[PDB]
Structures are given as C-alpha cells and as structure tokens.
Amino acid sequence: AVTNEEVNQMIEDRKVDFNQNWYFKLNANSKEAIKPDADVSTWKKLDLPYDWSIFNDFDHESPAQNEGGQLNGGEAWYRKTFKLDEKDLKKNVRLTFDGVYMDSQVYVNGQLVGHYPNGYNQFSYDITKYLQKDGRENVIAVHAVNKQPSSRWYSGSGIYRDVTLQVTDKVHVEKNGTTILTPKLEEQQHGKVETHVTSKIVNTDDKDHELVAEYQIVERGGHAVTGLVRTASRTLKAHESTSLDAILEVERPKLWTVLNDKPALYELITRVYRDGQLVDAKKDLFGYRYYHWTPNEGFSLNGERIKFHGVSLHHDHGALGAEENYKAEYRRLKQMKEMGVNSIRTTHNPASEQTLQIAAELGLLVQEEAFDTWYGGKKPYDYGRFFEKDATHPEARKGEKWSDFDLRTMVERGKNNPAIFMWSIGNEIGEANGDAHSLATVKRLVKVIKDVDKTRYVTMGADKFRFGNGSGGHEKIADELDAVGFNYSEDNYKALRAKHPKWLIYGSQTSSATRTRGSYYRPERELKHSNGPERNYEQSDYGNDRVGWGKTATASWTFDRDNAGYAGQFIWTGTDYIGEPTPWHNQNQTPVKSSYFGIVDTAGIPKHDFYLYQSQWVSVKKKPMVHLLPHWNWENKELASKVADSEGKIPVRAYSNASSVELFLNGKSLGLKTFNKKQTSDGRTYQEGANANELYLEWKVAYQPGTLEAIARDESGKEIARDKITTAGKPAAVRLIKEDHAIAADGKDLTYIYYEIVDSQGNVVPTANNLVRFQLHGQGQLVGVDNGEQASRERYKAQADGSWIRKAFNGKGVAIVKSTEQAGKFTLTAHSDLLKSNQVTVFTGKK
Amino acid sequence: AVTNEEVNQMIEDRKVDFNQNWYFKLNANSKEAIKPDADVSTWKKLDLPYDWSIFNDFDHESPAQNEGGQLNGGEAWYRKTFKLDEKDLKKNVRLTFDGVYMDSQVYVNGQLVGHYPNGYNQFSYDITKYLQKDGRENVIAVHAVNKQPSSRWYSGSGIYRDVTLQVTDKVHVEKNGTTILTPKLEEQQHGKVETHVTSKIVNTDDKDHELVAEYQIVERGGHAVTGLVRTASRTLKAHESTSLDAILEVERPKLWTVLNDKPALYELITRVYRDGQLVDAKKDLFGYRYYHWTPNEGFSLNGERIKFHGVSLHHDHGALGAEENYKAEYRRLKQMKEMGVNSIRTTHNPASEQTLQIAAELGLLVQEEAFDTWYGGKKPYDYGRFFEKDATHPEARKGEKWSDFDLRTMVERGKNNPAIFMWSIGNEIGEANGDAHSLATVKRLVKVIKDVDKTRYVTMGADKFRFGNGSGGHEKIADELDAVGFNYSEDNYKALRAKHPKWLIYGSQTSSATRTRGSYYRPERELKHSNGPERNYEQSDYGNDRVGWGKTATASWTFDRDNAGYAGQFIWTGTDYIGEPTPWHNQNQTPVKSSYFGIVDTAGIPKHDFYLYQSQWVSVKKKPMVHLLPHWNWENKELASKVADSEGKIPVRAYSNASSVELFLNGKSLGLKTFNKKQTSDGRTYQEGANANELYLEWKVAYQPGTLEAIARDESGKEIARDKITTAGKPAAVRLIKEDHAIAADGKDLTYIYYEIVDSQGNVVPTANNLVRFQLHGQGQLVGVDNGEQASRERYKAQADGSWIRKAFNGKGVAIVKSTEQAGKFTLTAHSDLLKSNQVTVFTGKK
Ligand SMILES: CC(=O)N[C@@H]1[C@@H](O)[C@H](O[C@@H]2O[C@H](CO)[C@H](O)[C@H](O)[C@H]2O)[C@@H](CO)O[C@H]1O
Numbered sequence A, B: 001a002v003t004n005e006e007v008n009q010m011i012e013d014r015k016v017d018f019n020q021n022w023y024f025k026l027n028a029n030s031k032e033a034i035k036p037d038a039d040v041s042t043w044k045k046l047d048l049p050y051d052w053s054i055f056n057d058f059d060h061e062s063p064a065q066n067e068g069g070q071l072n073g074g075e076a077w078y079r080k081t082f083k084l085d086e087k088d089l090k091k092n093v094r095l096t097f098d099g100v101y102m103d104s105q106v107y108v109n110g111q112l113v114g115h116y117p118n119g120y121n122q123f124s125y126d127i128t129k130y131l132q133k134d135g136r137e138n139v140i141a142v143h144a145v146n147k148q149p150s151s152r153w154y155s156g157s158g159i160y161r162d163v164t165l166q167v168t169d170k171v172h173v174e175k176n177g178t179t180i181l182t183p184k185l186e187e188q189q190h191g192k193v194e195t196h197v198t199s200k201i202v203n204t205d206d207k208d209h210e211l212v213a214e215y216q217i218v219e220r221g222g223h224a225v226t227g228l229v230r231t232a233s234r235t236l237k238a239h240e241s242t243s244l245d246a247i248l249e250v251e252r253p254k255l256w257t258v259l260n261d262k263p264a265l266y267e268l269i270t271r272v273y274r275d276g277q278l279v280d281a282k283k284d285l286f287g288y289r290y291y292h293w294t295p296n297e298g299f300s301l302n303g304e305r306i307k308f309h310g311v312s313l314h315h316d317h318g319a320l321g322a323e324e325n326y327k328a329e330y331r332r333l334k335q336m337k338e339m340g341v342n343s344i345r346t347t348h349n350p351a352s353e354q355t356l357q358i359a360a361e362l363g364l365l366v367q368e369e370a371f372d373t374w375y376g377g378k379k380p381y382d383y384g385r386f387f388e389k390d391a392t393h394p395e396a397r398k399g400e401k402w403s404d405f406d407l408r409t410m411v412e413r414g415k416n417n418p419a420i421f422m423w424s425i426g427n428e429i430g431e432a433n434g435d436a437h438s439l440a441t442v443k444r445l446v447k448v449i450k451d452v453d454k455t456r457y458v459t460m461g462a463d464k465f466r467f468g469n470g471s472g473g474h475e476k477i478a479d480e481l482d483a484v485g486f487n488y489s490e491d492n493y494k495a496l497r498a499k500h501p502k503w504l505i506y507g508s509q510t511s512s513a514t515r516t517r518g519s520y521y522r523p524e525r526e527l528k529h530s531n532g533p534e535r536n537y538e539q540s541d542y543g544n545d546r547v548g549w550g551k552t553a554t555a556s557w558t559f560d561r562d563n564a565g566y567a568g569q570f571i572w573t574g575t576d577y578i579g580e581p582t583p584w585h586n587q588n589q590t591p592v593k594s595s596y597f598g599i600v601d602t603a604g605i606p607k608h609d610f611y612l613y614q615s616q617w618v619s620v621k622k623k624p625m626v627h628l629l630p631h632w633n634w635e636n637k638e639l640a641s642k643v644a645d646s647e648g649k650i651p652v653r654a655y656s657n658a659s660s661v662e663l664f665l666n667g668k669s670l671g672l673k674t675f676n677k678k679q680t681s682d683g684r685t686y687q688e689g690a691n692a693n694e695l696y697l698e699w700k701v702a703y704q705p706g707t708l709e710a711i712a713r714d715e716s717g718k719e720i721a722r723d724k725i726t727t728a729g730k731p732a733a734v735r736l737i738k739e740d741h742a743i744a745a746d747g748k749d750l751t752y753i754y755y756e757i758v759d760s761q762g763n764v765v766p767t768a769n770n771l772v773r774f775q776l777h778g779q780g781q782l783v784g785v786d787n788g789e790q791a792s793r794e795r796y797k798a799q800a801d802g803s804w805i806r807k808a809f810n811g812k813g814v815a816i817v818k819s820t821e822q823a824g825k826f827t828l829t830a831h832s833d834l835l836k837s838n839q840v841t842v843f844t845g846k847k
C-alpha cells in the first residue's frame, strides 16, 4: 500500500527544527511575554540557539566570579508565534528543548506547561491541549533564569541548544520510546545476530484502535539488512499505552568501534499502523558492539584490549559561548580523534544531541554525566536545591524526585547510542561519604538507571581517593557502582587495588597541567601551582606547570600506561573553556577569565602537549609525525632568560612516534637521537627518551637565528616525517588560513578561519599581539573571534559599534563565520595597523 | 530572497519521470488509441520502458531473420492520461523520449504533434499548445512501428528508453540550451580555470520580460567551488530567444580521467530571473579534461599517454531485450572497467542517457555514433530512406534534412559530457566511396557538428581499408574527418600510415573472434569462419575461432600494442547481443539467435578472453590476477578428443599480469613458468609467453581428476594471486549466487542472481544443462532469465503459463529480479529435477 519514499517522507516530516523566528528580551515583563499580540518592537528577533551571556562584557564584580568567566546571567524571556498547518490540526504536538539554562518555565497561550529546573538535560512537553482550535496563532514563551552563582564553570544563559517540534498521529511511538538490544552479539557475530526491539506506543485518542508495528534495519547511509518484521495486531485502548516487541536478524553486522574514524552505524525504522493505516514512522540510530572490563586487564571492545585515551570536555565552544553547533562540536571531536583520543567524558552534565551523534559517527566512547552535585549543593543556585524535590513535570511518575526524573530521561534518551558506554551519577560529590543518606541515594540512582538500561557501566568520579591513603566511608559508595572513577588518585591506586581486588578502576579526571599556548617558563623545573606576579598570568607550554593536586601529562600517562588494571583516563581537559582560571581561581581583580587546563586552546589551536599525546596514542603506521618546541625567536632577553639554561642554550624538544629524530640547525646536524624501546610487564610496546620521565628527545641548542628542522625516521633509516621552526622577522602582514574551501548554505554550518601575524617572508611571528580588524562581505555572518589568551578581556563578539576586532596572541587567533541560507560566497578581509591586509573567500551552497 | 534549498527543489521539480501508468496494445486501432475515454480493458497496463519484441517466441520465418534475433516487430500504440496540477496550469510543458523504435508518431488530445523516424536518437516536443485548459484529462498516444527487416542486429520495438516531462516557466533555458567550455584548461589547470558558460533562454510568453541569469559551479556530490555569477539584466522580447554568457573561475579543479574509477565531475547550476523573480533553475553535468592526439604517438588525456582499450557495445541487455535500465548498464560498464577497458563505442546509434551518465561516472571515454547508413540504406526499412528527407519536426530549421536534425540534436544533447570525446557520423557506409555525392555529404555532416561543438574528434568507422592495399576513393572521405577509424585493417596500417602521415588513426572495429562460454575446440589451431555441422553451433572459448575478416584477441592486441600511431581499438564486441550469430549468420533454419563476438556472454558471465584482456590492460599493482582454462572434467571421450593433443594431454593455459605462474596438479608442481619481459620500440613495457603469439603460459597436462591450482608470483617470488579448477562429480544441487545483498525499493533497481549446477561438494559441473524452475516471493519481480547459449531458443521471459524456467548452460545461468516501490525483501527459490533446491534473499529499501 505505502511506498518506501512515502515512509521516508513521513519520517522526515515527523520532526522539525523549531529554532527560527524567536524574539528575545532580557528582564522582559511576564504579562507582556506570555500574552497574545504583544509589542515585540523592543525585543530582539533571532534564530536559536542563543546564549545571551557571551555578548556581555567581562565584569570584575560579576557574581559568577572568574570561575564562571565573569559574565553575568540574569533572566530573560523568549517568545515565538506559530500556526499549525491544516493537515496537522488533529495531530499530537510535542515541543523538545535540548537544553535551557536554567530554572525554565514554558507557557503556551498564557498557560504554564511546566517548570524544569535542570540546565543541561533535554526535556519535552506534550503541548497539544494548549493549542488553539481551527489553526489561529499560538504563543510559546520561555522564561530562563541564570541567577548567580549557579555554576563552577561558564554555563551560558538561555536556550543554548536546539528546540524541535514533533507532530505525530494520536497513535505514535512515545518520546524515547525505542529500545534496541543485542544480548548475544558476541556469540552470534559471525552469523545472524538477533536484534531485540521494543517500542512504547501511545494512543492519545479517546477511541480504541487496532495497532500493528513493522520494523526494518538499514545501514546508516547504506542499504537495508532485513525485510519487514511485523508484530501481531492487537487493540490499544483509548488513553493507554503498550510495549510492542519483535526480533530481527542481521547477518554479520559491521561492529561499531573506536579503532576506525567512520565506524558502522545502523538505523531501525519503525512503522506504526492504526486500524491498518500507516500513521507514524520513525528511525533510531544504533550500532553493534560488545565490551568487557576486568579488574586486572581493564577494558576490551569487541574482543580488542584498549585503554581509554580520554578527555573531559565542557559544553562551551569559546567565542560561541554555550551556543551548541554541529560543525563546532564536529571540529572539536575530530581534533580529539586526530590526537589519538578514543573516549570523552561530558563534565559534568548531560550532552547535547550533537555531541552524542558525532561521538557515534567518529567512533568515540562516551561517559555521559548526570550531576555535578547531589542534595548538598556546591553553589547556592545550582541544582542541589532541586535534587530531592518532587518532580512537577507533567510526565513524572508518582514519587519521582527531580534527580530520579532527570536521570531516567537522560538514560532513556541515550540508551541506543553505541558510543555511550558509561553513565555517571556524579562528580566529586562532597556529601557522598558513605553515611546512611548517601548510601540510600547511590542505590536509588543506580536502580533508576538499571530499570532502563543494564548494558552500561554506572560510575562516579571521586577525588576522595587522593587524600591520605584513599580509604574512608566513601569506599562504600564506590562498592555500589559498576566502575569506580579516581580523580587525581594515581598515588593511591596500588593500595586501593590491593584492598579492592574486584573493582573496575579508571582515572575519571587526571593531570590538570596548566598551559598557555606559545608561552614558556623554566623548562628544567616542574612548577607546582605557580601563580606569582612574575608569571604574568601565563603558564608554560613546555607542559611543566601543574596544579597542587595534579600531575604533568607525562607523569599521569606513564602511570596509566604501566598499569593494566587502571583502565585509562579522562584528561582534565581536552580543550580550554570559559571560567576556572586556576591557578588564579577566583582572584577576581586579576584579568583572567578562561582556563589553562586544555590540551587545545579555546580558539581550537593545539598546545604542544597535543603532540605529546599524539606521539603516545597514534601509531607510527597510522600517522607518522614529529613536532618541535619551543619557537625560535630568542632575541628578547627577558623572554630568553626564563628558558635558556646556565650556558645560554635553548632546550629544544621533539615529540615523535618514529624510531629516531635528527635535529638540524640551518642545515647542519646537531645529532640523531633514538627513542628507547620498552615493554610493559603485560607486553604492550612503548617508547621513551633519555630516562623514564622524558617522552621527548631533547637537544640543548646554542641560539643562532634561522631554521631548526627535525627529521623523523623509521628503524631502517627512512624519513617518515619532518617539522620545522623558523626565526621570524618583524610583523609585515596579517595572513588568513581557511579550514574549508566551502560550507553548506543552511544557516548552521560555519567555518574557522585562522589569522596569523607574519614577517615579510611569511613566517609566523610567535610573540605578536597585533590588533586585527575584520570585514565580512557576502553570504555569511561573523559569529566569533578568539585568540585563546587566558588573561585577555577582549570581546568574543562584535564591539558596541558593530565592528569585529581581536588581537593576535603569540602570533595567532581565529575568526568564525556562519553560513546563511543563500548560496554564494563570503570574503573575510583582515587589516592591522601598518601591516599588509589579506582576504580569503569561502563558497557556500550544497552540502 | 531565495534560499539554496528552494533552488534545489525547483531543479528537482523541473523534470519528472513520466514512465508510470501507460497502456499498451499491439495492432491497436488508431481512432481508439488517440481518442479521449477509450476502453483500455483489452490493453496491457504497464510502466515504461517496454520493449515488446523480447516477449515473442523465436520464429524461424521472422522477417528480422537470425541477424535480428528472429524476434518479430509489428506496430503498437501506447497511451497515457494525465492532468496538470493547479500550480502548473500556465507552465510550458515539454515531453522527451530517450528512444522509440521506430518511425514514431505522438498525438496529444487527438492532434499529431510529430513524426520522428529515428529509432535511437532522443527527441522531444513542446506540447503546451495541445493541452486542455483548466486541468481536465489529457491523452498522449504514441504509435511505434518496427517493420522488418529494419536492422542488422536486434533492435527491440517500442518505447524502450525513459520518457520524461519537463514543466517550466514560460521563460526558461531551452532543451539542451547549456554550453560549457574551458578553452585554456591545459594552461590554467594549476590555478584559476576560466569556465565559459552559455545559456539559450527562451521567452514563450506574449509579453516582453527583463531577464537575468545567475550561475554557480559545484562538485557533483561535493561542495560549491564558485559564488554566484550574474549576467547584465536585459529585455527578452515576447516569442524570442537569446544566448546569455558568463565566465566563472574554478581554482585547481580535479580533472576528469579514465585512470580512476570515480572520476571528478562538476555541475553548473543556472538560475533564471524573469522581472527579478526566480522562475527557472537547472543543473548540467560536466568535467574538466583536455586531450591531444598526434599521428605518431596517438592519444593523451590530461597530458598522460594512453591507448584506447575499447569495446563496441550494442544497446540490448540480454534477457531485458532493448529495455534500458540504469543498474543493467552500470553492471555492464563496471564489468568493462574491471577488464581494463577505458573506452566504449556505441555501435551504431546514439546512446541512452544512462550509458552517457554512467560513462562520465565510471571514467570511460565514449565515441557516440549517429548513423549505421547514409542515403544508400542497408536494409529496406532502416533509416536510409529518411536520411535525405526534409525534417518535419516542429523545431527543425529551414532546409534541415533528418540527418542534419538528428546529428545536430545528438551533439547538442551530449556536448557537455566529459566522457564523450568522438562523434561518429557513420559505420561501414558502403556509399561513402569518395564520389561527389558522398564528398558533399561528409562535409555537410562535419559542418553540422562543428557548428555546435569543435572540441571532439569527428570520425567514421570504415572497413574499405581492409580490401587490397586499402587505398581508393574512400580516402577522400577520410581526409574530411578529424580521425580515421579502421575496421579490421591492421594488415594495411603500415602502408596507409606511410601514405597519410597526418591522419589520426585507430581501430574502430577489431578482432571479431567468436566464442561460446565453456566450449572448447582444437586449441592447437586457429579456425577461420569454422561453421561446419561438427561445430554443433558452438565456438571455442580458447579464443582460437575468428571470422574470415577477423583476428584473434592476441593478433589484434599485439598489433595495437606494438604500434604507437594506431591510437587503440574498439573490440567487436564487449558483450554478446541478440542477433548476428556469425558464423551462422542468416542460416535461418539453424537454431542460433544471438552473437558469439562478445568477450562477455549475454548473461553477463565473462568468457576466458575477458581474463586475457585483463591480464594485458590491468596493471599488476592495481589488481594482481591469474586465470586458468579450460575446465577439468575430461571423462567424456567425445569432449576430450576435440581438445587433447596426440599424447592425450590437455593444454592448460594461464592468463596473468604477474611475473610467473606455477601450476599444481593435486598438490604436485608441474613446473613454474615465467613471462618474458619486453619493450615496445617507444619504451612501453609488456609481457609474453613462449613466443610472440602467446600471451598465456601453457602446460600440457596428462589428465588426472582432482584440482589444478595456479600460483602467480611477483619477481621476488611472493604469491600475489591464485586460481583453481576442480573436477566436478555428478549434478547434486542448484546453487544461487547473489551479486547484491540488497537493492533500492524504487521499482527500477535490479539484481543479477547467478544459478549454478553443483556436485555434492559444491563444485560447478561445467558441462551441466539441467532445467531450473524459479519461484519468487516478496517485494520483487522476475524480469529475465538467461544462460548466454547462442543456440538456445528458450524464452528470456516468463512462459505462457506465467512460470519462470531456464536451463543451465555449461553449469551456469542468471535470473534478474527488479525491485518494487515497497521496502522489504524477496526470496528467489530454484528447483531442478532430482537435485537439491536452493533459495536466497535480497533486501530492498533505502539506496
Ligand atoms: C580550595 C581548593 O584548592 N580546592 C581544590 C579543588 O578546587 C579541586 O577540585 C578541582 O578544581 C578544579 C578548578 O580549580 C576543577 O573544578 C576540577 O574539576 C576539580 O577537580 C580538588 C581536586 O581534588 O582539590 C581541592 O582541594
């Protein structure tokens, strides 16, 4: 009766992007916000997502303090009017918010639909009963409040993630209603794999209906791998719901894995028939994989042993603030993969849909974290105050607290995503001390999850393990988890492992080295929480600065590498983020406003430790590489005296996954050096330098301006990689560097264009801080400028006169341009006082 | 004003598939066919394309004779009713036929729109003035006549290619109205390449309008590579047309080439504005490439010297008859590429849109041929009788003959396709003898083409060069061409080259070896036109049979390989086709009905010479291979006596592109043999066997049943390929072999499922001819069965009782199943008397 193309059309039509044509106003009056035909002339017309905090100036007196990036919050309304199409008049309508920060209220046509306090969890409302009859204008108004301090890092404020509308028949698969399981995958993988599917179907009509479900599995961007599999026709009564179940067999599916960069994904297509008529159809993304984790050997994925080469990531995107964007998140995660990262932790809140989808697409394992606090709170306006209050959401179950409801709906949202392998129910929960209350709480939370999904490790991250020998009442909380995350606790691992032989252990937060891109200080010394005025609000890109409780990248990695029972780590952090500028944390009159912890700066530019990790985690067969530091501009006596040794020599270091590196100064060899090859006690091969604490090769080089070139070779002496640093002359030009020749004309895709200050030969000037002004013409929109400097208080957005400016920092920065909905092109031009201007052009059109 | 997605939607909506819901009736009455509300109950309802001849039984008295496959033609009507949508009431409507064989008439609402005699050329009609006002039902009726004999090969009858409807604004780009040129590509290729575009725009309205065109170039399935480039706004008067022109620059485009299997293609998007409103948009496929051809060095593509490794291909697809199908043509051309083919010749008629598009997509050079005759005719009902008659098409220009009009519109259709590099204006034109009439004709035809397109070689194929020394009046015709095709004229090449130093020469038809898959005869001897009753209507798969005027694959290839000034060849033929069963040509009471010339049989199964060519044309780096012949079942004394030498030994031969092959009999070596490496006088490297006439390695093997295994090695002695033949026991089962696990549910995609007769160990029985019956269940449709046997008179289609049956031939055959528009799956089951049945399942759904 119904064609495949009609089914695919219905799937498409079921969900619409509801982001366009909102009006926004800070401190708006409630009565005006919610009422029909309000005067919106003093409101800002815009397309969502929109984080309103990122447009503020930095404020030394901000109640967020510098931990929150010194950007104020407040309260605001957003409103939108819409009519249902005539064909949709009798349909069920659900409105979904992927994240609204925070304490939100949604009104439809003057009536309160719900209050949702959580700032990060997706939530949705069935709004059908609130809509106007006969297709007259409806008004949605959303109140968002960011009362500070509410957060230990930059949160952003408002509707910072997508909003979608689902329009379905009265009989439909409920929100997150699909469950897909493959309980015998490991045994069945070389033949027919039984794929058990379940659909929660809802009849919102006031008549009984005959119900059939029909399923097909297809390769995502591939071909069908099953026929149609139908359930038995049965009655679903008026206002009731039911779970239909079926088993489909897929022959030799490709297994999802982190060991490729385009892992295999599948989609389940569900068709719903009401009295023999096709009324609903949807798809659900999933993949085939299995895993195992033992105390002494750690983790394995589809039978292959691996370690979590992981990063902790906050949700902000630098100059974009909290605004979620598919392309921004893709760039960041792709950059993490290029470093050899295979896992991410969403610290410390539910992920966007974009993050989770990209992780499944790129092959990254995900630990998704529900809570930064329990009932104790960490900041007076955080989620702590809601944690034990009764959930008032109209779909909450009897007795559910906010914590029950939020945790349940997060798990239901993500329970088919193959990237997700762990659910965290908290990070550094001070009150989780093994008292009777915290014991009751941990068991309640574990059970909420296990009542939805038993296939993923329930965990928590805890720093209590780093104090003394690590033992204490908190151990009883850890016994209730499937896996136990240690924050900065390497020193107590051996003792805790002997005490708890059965625990699945990993580092949920590690290292916490602090680094400023292109800035160097006392390479010969490890500096602990060094925040004196002589540091001038910078940390060392040699990677030798770390906080009091942290470790260098080398110390935390070599520990992990050498211990098979510590299953991996999530580095604090993969990228810089706005706020927590430790070691100047909450020194509010200093200029700092963003973090030093990242391996990559907020502008998306790698610090040198990126290449350290790459050298350790990416095999020489996959991507032979070599990387030199520091720069080669040592004219300035003050810069050089902080770096040069007693003989005036610069320590030049190479990270490489090759067998040897030879360093040349102006064409003359300074000597070939060879990594020492070694084995872990369980047989894993690794390389190190001159001793166990050095993963680089090092030369002490007397300074002669020119070119330093590193030649990396395989064991047989063939060159497989090279890197080169050059002494720059004085600034002569701004140069622009496109990442993309073209992007999609969809009003969503965007591109990162780097700007650099270069001398007259085209060498980047590594000390340069020149002010750059930007012009944009054509079919694009400037949406951000950044240079990653922690101590900068420059705007990320346009100046008050509409202009776009940003200094270089150590030679570099980035401008971010978003496409419009019109095909064509845009040209970005950069200017700087007394330097040559430059422009580049990026085309826009079909994806 | 207008978004990219709206532009792409308009492009899509401009052209629709008009193939569904036609009614067909052989010998229908004209008055009933054309009139409104005819009773169609005695008509067959069907979706086009539909070749009605392929459903006939073979007929010994067919006026087609066996050269035409002994399948009758006749005359038939097709009719379809349709209403214009309300939004389309004032639009221009053009109806396009990609091919109707032949002598067609199209009626719209009782009125004759046109008579088009050509059976292969695409044609279209503006039917706007014939349509009903206010959106009442329109009737299209198409009369097709296949009065025989009209053809030297199987033509098919009726509407055997797609029909499309274009619905556009009154102001629009005319049919084939786009020209795209890159005249400085070779010079500009490393920077910005100027892409000159021209659009013929037509104003069919009776008011003047202001006209602007806007262009963008995009990578096909990639991203934009230009912005929007607009023309100056100017008036286009009522009922007039004009040519707009613009230049776009594309930076370093990827060059289209035959040396990869996914060459780079681009699309030009044109937007047309009428009084500032976007009213028309379309795209045109093209690619960037340049070529050169010199008398002494032959052809080069983008600066790389190559030879045409070419095949001649007829339009029929075996059991599909003349029905054109994208998937069938894709399979065939992909199979040609896997053999090392880089060029095709469309013998001897314009190509379908599918052929030309697939050739651009797979990287095959195309010579498209317009005529099998001029004014002389070859068969009484062929095109000869129309060639010099005045074109009556409503869009013909004053004084145009049918030959002018057909040649012009073919060139206009294909002038942007990067695969097309040569236009042929005839093949073996007997009357092109250099008399005054034929001289006038050749110059007229060359000029028709050069008035449209100067970038492609105008050519002809001629066998007059093979008689005597090759000289004669025909030389004067050849002097008028850009390139001269020699049919079977290798023996006179040296003399003709010395006589005409400036000619660009190639073999437009070569070899014409005759072969039956799996049948072997006197391998020690070259057999010339051997058609005695002892041959039992079979030819030798050793490749040693050829027609009187032909050559073996080896003799024609080694000639080409050794002569740089003979630019390549088009083998007669790439695949078998229905009709011309030489050397039993027009011996009408014999059983033969299909050709022996193909390298691949009509069922798509390679003959052994496929692997000969592959061994010569595909590099060992690209695909190391080895291939053994004959089979290893020599029990039957009569079969063996035609093959075994005087000592009873079987000559076993290996084709390979490797350095050496070692043959093993039942695990025991029969000796490693090594190809002799040699060079052409111009330095091209090649391999040969024991002497210059042997491209294989050969062993004379005393027959012991079991396994023969060939191990092919590189120079250093590493194994890079192997092949294996096994003695089969008696038939025990039918086995089915899927090419596809799944296909699209679009009612167009189809799949080839091979069936084989196997013994109880799963070895193919190479002599087996068992009758197989097929059942199909689920979402598919059987559309063909075939086994490639020339002497078979079995149906390709269903039996008169609706059943599907076909014998194996030498162990094998194929069944072809088409998808429907519903997702799901189909199961094909095969049965055979006293053997085990087998089934396979193919899924259908998203592409
Ligand atoms: C007062 C003090 O020094 N407290 C520290 C904590 O700040 C620290 O927690 C870490 O703090 C950083 C920001 O500086 C970030 O929030 C990390 O996620 C968090 O772990 C803790 C680590 O054990 O030590 C305390 O003593």
Ligand SMILES: CC(=O)N[C@@H]1[C@@H](O)[C@H](O[C@@H]2O[C@H](CO)[C@H](O)[C@H](O)[C@H]2O)[C@@H](CO)O[C@H]1O
Binding pocket: B152, B428, B463, B466, B487, B488, B509, B549, B580, B582, B585
């Ligand atoms: C009577 C005779 O033998 N004539 C032959 C031609 O048939 C032949 O032309 C070829 O014929 C084959 C089919 O047998 C096919 O049509 C080829 O395309 C065509 O070239 C011709 C070749 O020179 O020789 C004649 O003498």
